[PDB]
Every structure is written in structure tokens, then in C-alpha cells.
Enzyme design. Structure first.
Site, PDB file in Angstrom:
ATOM      1  N   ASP A  36     -51.722  36.877  19.135  1.00  0.00           N
ATOM      2  CA  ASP A  36     -50.527  37.080  19.947  1.00  0.00           C
ATOM      3  C   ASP A  36     -49.362  36.169  19.535  1.00  0.00           C
ATOM      4  O   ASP A  36     -49.333  35.004  19.896  1.00  0.00           O
ATOM      5  CB  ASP A  36     -50.909  36.798  21.407  1.00  0.00           C
ATOM      6  N   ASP A  92     -43.729  40.857  18.803  1.00  0.00           N
ATOM      7  CA  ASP A  92     -44.793  40.449  19.709  1.00  0.00           C
ATOM      8  C   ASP A  92     -46.076  41.267  19.507  1.00  0.00           C
ATOM      9  O   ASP A  92     -46.203  42.390  19.995  1.00  0.00           O
ATOM     10  CB  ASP A  92     -44.277  40.606  21.141  1.00  0.00           C
TER      11      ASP A  92
HETATM   12  C1  UA4 Z   1     -52.481  39.196  24.973  1.00  0.00           C
HETATM   13  C2  UA4 Z   1     -51.726  38.394  26.014  1.00  0.00           C
HETATM   14  C3  UA4 Z   1     -50.306  38.896  26.148  1.00  0.00           C
HETATM   15  N1  UA4 Z   1     -49.340  38.307  25.402  1.00  0.00           N
HETATM   16  C4  UA4 Z   1     -48.043  38.709  25.454  1.00  0.00           C
HETATM   17  N2  UA4 Z   1     -47.111  38.096  24.691  1.00  0.00           N
HETATM   18  N3  UA4 Z   1     -47.641  39.711  26.264  1.00  0.00           N
HETATM   19  C5  UA4 Z   1     -48.531  40.355  27.046  1.00  0.00           C
HETATM   20  N4  UA4 Z   1     -48.093  41.360  27.846  1.00  0.00           N
HETATM   21  C6  UA4 Z   1     -49.963  39.925  27.018  1.00  0.00           C
HETATM   22  C7  UA4 Z   1     -50.980  40.659  27.838  1.00  0.00           C
HETATM   23  C8  UA4 Z   1     -51.482  40.325  28.953  1.00  0.00           C
HETATM   24  C9  UA4 Z   1     -52.306  41.028  29.501  1.00  0.00           C
HETATM   25  C10 UA4 Z   1     -52.754  42.143  29.046  1.00  0.00           C
HETATM   26  C11 UA4 Z   1     -52.319  42.643  27.880  1.00  0.00           C
HETATM   27  C12 UA4 Z   1     -51.414  41.911  27.225  1.00  0.00           C
HETATM   28  N5  UA4 Z   1     -52.775  43.807  27.353  1.00  0.00           N
HETATM   29  C13 UA4 Z   1     -52.250  44.357  26.100  1.00  0.00           C
HETATM   30  C14 UA4 Z   1     -53.023  43.722  24.952  1.00  0.00           C
HETATM   31  C15 UA4 Z   1     -52.260  43.932  23.652  1.00  0.00           C
HETATM   32  O1  UA4 Z   1     -53.130  43.849  22.523  1.00  0.00           O
HETATM   33  C16 UA4 Z   1     -52.416  43.732  21.289  1.00  0.00           C
HETATM   34  C17 UA4 Z   1     -53.584  44.611  28.060  1.00  0.00           C
HETATM   35  O2  UA4 Z   1     -53.984  45.664  27.565  1.00  0.00           O
HETATM   36  C18 UA4 Z   1     -53.972  44.296  29.492  1.00  0.00           C
HETATM   37  C19 UA4 Z   1     -55.472  44.517  29.692  1.00  0.00           C
HETATM   38  C20 UA4 Z   1     -53.134  45.256  30.336  1.00  0.00           C
HETATM   39  C21 UA4 Z   1     -53.500  46.472  30.524  1.00  0.00           C
HETATM   40  C22 UA4 Z   1     -52.839  47.339  31.212  1.00  0.00           C
HETATM   41  F1  UA4 Z   1     -53.270  48.578  31.374  1.00  0.00           F
HETATM   42  C23 UA4 Z   1     -51.667  47.033  31.795  1.00  0.00           C
HETATM   43  C24 UA4 Z   1     -51.135  45.673  31.637  1.00  0.00           C
HETATM   44  F2  UA4 Z   1     -49.988  45.347  32.186  1.00  0.00           F
HETATM   45  C25 UA4 Z   1     -51.855  44.800  30.920  1.00  0.00           C
HETATM   46  O3  UA4 Z   1     -53.740  42.911  29.792  1.00  0.00           O
END
Ligand code: UA4
Ligand code: UA4
EC number: 3.4.23.15
Lengths: 336, 336
Positions: free
Chosen positions: A34, A222
């Protein structure tokens, strides 16, 4: 003179994660790599099981690692879609044949929403120490300090989703770039500022018109974001031109309208980066009765990083991305 | 030393198209890569809006390109199904990391039947200069000239459609092939002559007996055609042996009975190339209360090319295809 490719799994084109090992013997974890954050964390064995997300994920047990070193400092990580909390711990971490003594978060508070929807357990921040919480040295700085990498760069390939398991979900190269997964040449854009994987974006066009990002805007590259995101006012206007209806979290079009939606282009460093509708709609159907989600969202990222657009996995899928710490720039090439 | 791939979009198993850029800066068009024709063409900005197809497609604006050179020589391009007309222009075309100066057609006449149905904007002819209207040098010949390709060949992968994935629609490779999308080794069949991608076929078996093409016939390997086709007569006999009947426009079978239908084998260069019923029946359901069409149609192609069978998208889906200009032959291997 070493590179290190880590194979990534692609879940439904929204999550991309690979394996790391932590401790002795290694306890393995699925983690998202990330560039939008700078801390490493995995769920902890001390996470109360009243957090159901901790019941459904791999938990780090410090009592099973002989190489563990205590710290215990509290930390909270605030992502745009959710938050985790816990405390700091030190141990050996293996990332694709590289071994590094790393400070990371043992997370004891892990909300069911969104983390019950996470196929991954934790996250590896590939961002700068300037945005690190608790001022913990990020993992790539510790790897750079070993002096084993050929170049001080890392690179991301995110594949399209596949029904079979012979195609690779993706790949992160530490110390270089894999010419098997891009073609043509890299086109580089300097970072506005060191400390953030964020570049100047000159414009965003939708169709036969430049209706967005007039006079300029920001673009965080990102790899931890599923979608392309812009500000709420940027996206309401983007989605007016598309004809999408604002659902709860996402936007949608009638599934039959999907293939005829216009190209969206992103002007970065004297080159246009163009997604067709095939790149940003989840074409699950061609039915006028079913609804189809777009891989573009609204996200209001607060200062100092924002307000900004975020080029997440929707974008990186199309364009192989090299992150260059040595010269503070980001390179893009057509993925293959 | 170079290969260049373009990812393709699969629309409903009947259209396959990828991106090219024309001009400086590049304007993006969706094009069918078409071995059954030899001219490049995209819709024109000069195309009147009375043709509804031009209202709903991407138009090439020559005034917005600094690499454009004028040449107003008229041309008509006639395909099996539709017909377009326009004039010639010169510019740089980007095909997947390769750039090449190319003469193509700007199209000003574009009938609603069928180009309103076209999800693609234009066509990139991969045929020979001999079938090129206006004697225009085809794009693959111009790319061969810059002498960058590994081999003087290009290959096609057309994937099956799936409503539960964002899968690769397909892939063309200029300069070679991608073993990720086939298995085993190629077996080749020489062309009758240079100038047409057309081979000898030694028979077509329906199940056990070799009912058709007993004394030999011709087979166009046509990546720009949706279906396998034969002459009206040959298809009549084939469909009577399958138990299919002409509904109104197309031949149909009860959807439940689709799996009972016998294999069809095309004898090419001493090997049998076999499609099962799963490969040539559009099984939109398996309901005993609904009818299902076949991906095989009648098409009377006129001389000199015809009368011939044409192995279109139905065939290529089953067999990864390599078009070999160096040796004037076509290689097939089982797609995956
Ligand atoms: C990794 C940590 C991270 N880092 C930054 N820079 N932005 C974000 N949004 C996140 C993040 C946080 C939480 C999160 C995710 C990403 N992702 C996406 C992974 C991406 O892979 C490359 C998810 O899929 C998940 C499970 C999620 C699922 C969903 F259906 C709705 C959401 F709002 C979040 O939960
Ligand atoms: C590429 C140009 C081409 N090249 C050669 N060699 N043959 C044909 N028939 C064509 C052609 C012409 C027009 C045409 C299409 C193909 N295709 C098929 C694309 C194939 O992609 C792999 C179409 O889908 C379309 C829109 C069409 C839709 C329809 F419902 C009936 C039609 F008659 C035509 O219109």
C-alpha cells in the site's frame, strides 16, 4: 544486485495481496502492499474475539516467536474506509526472499465493517516515513538500508480478474521492474513533494470535452485503494456525464449501458492515460434490468495529503507502475 | 527482439476489439483486428450526424493532431455484413507500445445497420496488401518494415464470455505468441496462396461420418468474423444433421438438447480440429422450454475469395491461432 518478486492474489478485482512471514518460526499473513500508507500491521492474538474480524483472520502470536522484541507503544491507523488500533512490536519479516527486522502494529481493534470483507489480514505500507504513524521506519526504508537492491525502486503489476488459477493476480518487484508485465517505455512524473506518492495531474477529460480538473489538481498513486477516487464534487460531475446513479457507497449504470460509456483520460506529465469503459465498469451482465458498478468512487481525503484524486487498482491494472525513491518520481507503462 | 500485445474486450462472444491510438497526441479508438480485411479505418470528425452511428462513436479529428498528413483519396470498404466509405489520411498509430506511420481511412458514411450495434469504432485489417483497397500498405507490413519484431507472425486469443468475472476478453500478439493462452505446440497448415489467409480443408465430420466437404473445400481464417460460416447449401445439410431448424433469422435447437449434439471436426493439414456442442451452441440456458441459437451461420462469400467456409470467432475461441507471414501458413493450438 538483487530483485524480489512477490506473487499477489487478485480477489474480485478489488483486493490485491501477497504473503509475508513474521517471526520464528514464520507466521504467514496475507497483506496489501500500500503506497497510500506507511505502516505495517497484522491482526494480533490479543485482539478480543468480540471483534469478529479477528475471528476470521490470521493472528500474530508473539508468544510463538523467539525473534520477537517488545515495544508496546499504542498506535492508530486511519484509512479512508476504516480504522485499526493496537500496539507496536518488532520481529523479523520475510518479503519475497528479503529478510528485515521491522517494527509493525499488532492490531487489537479491527471493525467488522469493513474488515469482515477483507480477504487479506493486514497491510504493508510502501509510503514514506514522513506519513508514518508513530514515526516508525517503514519496511522499504529498512530494506534500502541493507544495500542489496539493484535500484531503490519498487513496481506493481495488477492483473485483470480470472476464472482460472493459472494466471497470476499480480506482482510487486522490490529493486526493479518486470519487463514481462509492461510494454513500450516508462514515462516519468516527478513527485510534487517527497514524503508522498503524489504527483501533479494537469487534467481529466470525459468524452469529447475536458470538463474536470481544469487548471490542475493532485493525484496520489495508491496501490492500497481498489478504485480511482476524486473529491465529492469532482465525482458528482464525472458521474453526471456518465449517467450513473449515486447508490449508497458506489455509483452504477444500467448494465447494458456499460460498454458505451465514454473514455476517461488522465493527463499526467505530458502524456494522456486513457481508460475505456472495459477498464472501469464491472461488466457482470448486459441486462437493462441488472445494475453494474463502476470502479470509480468519491473520497474526500483531508490535508495535508488532499484534497486529491487517488489512482488505485482500476488505474494500475491498465498501467504498470514503478515507484522510484531514488529520484522521487513515478513511472507508468502499458501493462500486459 | 520485440513483442507487442493488445488486450481485447469480448462483447457477447460476437465482437472482439482493443485499443489503438491515432495522432499526436494519440486519440483512442476501439478496433477489431481483422485477418479477413486489409485496410485500417476509424470514424471521421467530418462524418455527418445524420448517420446515427457517427453520433455514438469516437471520431478522429485531424486538426487536433500535429502528425496528420492530408490525402483525400476516396475509398469504399465492403464487408460481408456492412459497408463504409470515406477518404485516406496519414498519421502515427500506437498498437500496444509500437508506433507506426500508417495510411488509414477516415469514414464519413456509416450505416445504422450494422454499425449502431458495433461496440468497436473501427477496424485494423491484418490481411495482405493484395486484398487492400486503394493499394494501401496494411499496418502489419509497415511494422515488419521497422524490423523490431521477434518473428513475422501475429496471434489471436479470443476468450469465452463469463458474466461472473472481469476477465481477459482476448489478446493479439504482434511478433509472436503467448503460451499462457494455449497448450502444447502449434501445428501449421500452409495457405493455398499468399494474399489471403485461406487454407485447404479436407472435410467436415458431424460425429462419426464425414458428411460434408468430401472432395475438399476452402477455409478462410477470419478473426473479424463472429461465427464459423459455410455456404448456404453446406450449412443447410449440417443443420439437418444436427437436428436444428431455422427459427426465423437463425438456426435453433431446444436449449436442453444442446449437449446431446454431436462434435464437429474440421480436417486441416492432416489433423482434426473438433468443436463440441458446448463450443458452438450459445447456451443462454439449458431450459427444455427455450430455444438456443448456434454460433455457425450461412454466408455465401462471392469470388474470388469465396465460395468458402470461414473460421471466425467460434473457431478461434477453441483454437489459439498464429498467422505466419514469413512462411505463409497458420498454426493452431488448443486455447486455454
Ligand atoms: C489496504 C489499506 C488501505 N490503504 C489505503 N491507502 N486506502 C484504503 N482505502 C485501504 C483499505 C482499507 C480497507 C479496506 C480496503 C482498503 N480494501 C481494498 C483493498 C485494496 O487492495 C489493493 C478492501 O477491500 C476492504 C476489505 C473494503 C472492502 C469493501 F467492500 C469496502 C471498503 F470500503 C473497504 O477494506
Ligand atoms: C471487423 C470487420 C469485419 N471483417 C470481416 N472480415 N467480416 C465482417 N463481417 C466484419 C464486420 C462487419 C461488420 C460488423 C461486424 C463485423 N461485427 C462483428 C465484429 C467481429 O469482431 C471480432 C459486428 O458485430 C457488427 C456490429 C454486426 C452486428 C450485428 F448484429 C450484425 C452484423 F452483421 C454485424 O458489424
Amino acid at each position: 544486485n538483487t530483485t524480489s518478486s512477490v506473487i499477489l492474489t487478485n480477489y474480485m478485482d478489488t483486493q490485491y495481496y501477497g504473503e509475508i512471514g513474521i517471526g520464528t518460526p514464520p507466521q504467514t499473513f496475507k497483506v496489501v502492499f500500500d503506497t497510500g500508507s506507511s505502516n505495517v500491521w497484522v491482526p494480533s492474538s490479543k485482539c478480543s474475539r468480540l471483534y469478529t474480524a479477528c475471528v476470521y483472520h490470521k493472528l500474530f502470536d508473539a508468544s510463538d516467536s523467539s525473534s520477537y522484541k517488545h515495544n508496546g507503544t499504542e498506535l492508530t491507523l486511519r484509512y479512508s474506509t476504516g480504522t485499526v488500533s493496537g500496539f507496536l512490536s518488532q520481529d523479523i519479516i520475510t518479503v519475497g526472499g528479503i529478510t528485515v527486522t521491522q517494527m509493525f502494529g499488532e492490531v487489537t481493534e479491527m471493525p467488522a465493517l469493513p474488515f469482515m470483507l477483507a480477504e487479506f489480514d493486514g497491510v504493508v505500507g510502501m509510503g514514506f516515513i514522513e506519513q508514518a504513524i508513530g514515526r516508525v521506519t517503514p519496511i522499504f526504508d529498512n530494506i534500502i538500508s541493507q544495500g542489496v537492491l539493484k535500484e531503490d525502486v519498487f513496481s506493481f503489476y495488477y492483473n485483470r480478474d480470472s476464472e482460472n488459477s493459472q494466471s497470476l493476480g499480480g506482482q510487486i518487484v522490490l529493486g526493479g521492474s518486470d519487463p514481462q508485465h509492461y510494454e513500450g517505455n516508462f514515462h516519468y512524473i516527478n513527485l510534487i513533494k517527497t514524503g508522498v506518492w503524489q504527483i501533479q495531474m494537469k487534467g481529466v477529460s470525459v468524452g469529447s470535452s475536458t470538463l474536470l480538473c481544469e487548471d490542475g489538481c493532485l493525484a496520489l498513486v495508491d496501490t492500497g485503494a481498489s478504485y480511482i477516487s476524486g473529491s465529492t464534487s469532482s465525482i458528482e460531475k464525472l458521474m453526471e456525464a456518465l449517467g450513473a446513479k449515486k447508490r449508497l457507497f458506489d455509483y452504477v449504470v444500467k448494465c447494458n449501458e456499460g460498454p458505451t460509456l465514454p473514455d476517461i483520460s488522465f493527463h499526467l506529465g505530458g502524456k494522456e492515460y486513457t481508460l475505456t469503459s472495459a477498464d472501469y465498469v464491472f461488466q457482470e451482465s448486459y441486462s437493462s434490468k441488472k445494475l453494474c458498478t463502476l470502479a470509480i468512487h468519491a473520497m474526500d481525503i483531508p490535508p495535508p495529503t488532499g484534497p486529491t484524486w487517488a489512482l488505485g487498482a482500476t488505474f494500475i491494472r491498465k498501467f504498470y507502475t514503478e515507484f522510484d525513491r531514488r529520484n522521487n518520481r513515478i513511472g507508468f507503462a502499458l501493462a500486459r
